[PDB]
Amino acid sequence: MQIFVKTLTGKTITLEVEPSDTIENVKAKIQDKEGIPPDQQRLIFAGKQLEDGRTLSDYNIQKESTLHLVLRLRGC
């Protein structure tokens, strides 16, 4: 199933995934397309941060869902 990942600059990244693929895996796919390391990514779907351990299945992601990419680069 295709899903899209929207970045803060409205760029949309399209991915081919599977329900059993984990969030870590999706972030890996993102690294491949965009060069951003998984630890520097956060993914959001329906307003909630997605946990790396869990799969696309137990979050109700479906065909053509939109996820949001947030970069974790800044602190104090």
Binding site: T7, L8, T9, E34, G35, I36, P37, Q40, L69, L71, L73, R74, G75, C76
Partner: protein
Amino acid sequence: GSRDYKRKYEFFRRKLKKQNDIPNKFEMKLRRATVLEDSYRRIMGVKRADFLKARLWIEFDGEKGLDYGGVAREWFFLISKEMFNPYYGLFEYSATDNYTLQINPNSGINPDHLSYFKFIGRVAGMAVYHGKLLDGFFIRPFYKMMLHKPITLHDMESVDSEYYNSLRWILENDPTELDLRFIIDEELFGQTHQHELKNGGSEIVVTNKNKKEYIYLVIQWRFVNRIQKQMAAFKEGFFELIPQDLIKIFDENELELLMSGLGDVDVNDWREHTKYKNGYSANHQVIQWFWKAVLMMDSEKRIRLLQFVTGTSRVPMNGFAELYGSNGPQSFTVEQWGTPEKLPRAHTCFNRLDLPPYESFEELWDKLQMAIENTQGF
């Protein structure tokens, strides 16, 4: 602001009037070392404020024959450095680690303050009247007050985010547990007066009943209540040059842009006052590429790089030599960190950029751009 801005501006400039009975020029002879007091005596001396509309003819320190507009641009710059200098007590930075300006509620320590605020108001109007810029950026609520717009909780977000979320929390969650009362404590020269927002003072404890009104009073107190007279004097000077009704075609963001422009950064200054860490030095290849990138950045991107590292897009009056962070003065810093496939990171509190040792200029460029562009202020 572009395009929509440019039309507004043209429409604005074309409405500005100047009377027939006004000299072709307004003459000032100033010395740079005393630019503030010399400018003050001259501008506050004028018979009619309208005289300030004639073409500025400025001579500094006896120098004859410099281009008029260049000197005027210099004057607006020098006089800004002085009027907004916190040492004089009129304006102050909105926080120890930011450099946006706000009226200092204790400005009255100089008895003449109200008259200086009128002077600043006039200079700000002269800038706008004559198509020049001030050098200094005010907090949003200052611009909203010029426009006669109410200040709200949301207006706090742009000034103090930490404070904002707390006020935000006791709007949604119950505040009773922690015995909060309608008392606010002001710090002044290391001292602490305490203030109560209403009569009855300390005894009232913040609950869900009084909750909203509490949040109100904190807001008016922090932004509005105690700088009324100062803001009225500034607005009075400013409206002797620019009609109040006409200025209202601009929202607060355009007004800021009208008065002060973008806030271009001095890159040479910045680079001169950078510290390096964990292996880097001014001569290190990666750092050479870094500054090559910054120099190849346009103005808004430079500003965004600066916000990304420091948490603010603004620079203090003394420039990058006088950068502060959360715990006192902190130079802009670049520390070697991570591996070349990482995006850069930032510790905003310490004005520190964690830059990977990228192995080509282009890779440094792409990764820096991606970092800056995909993080957001607010």
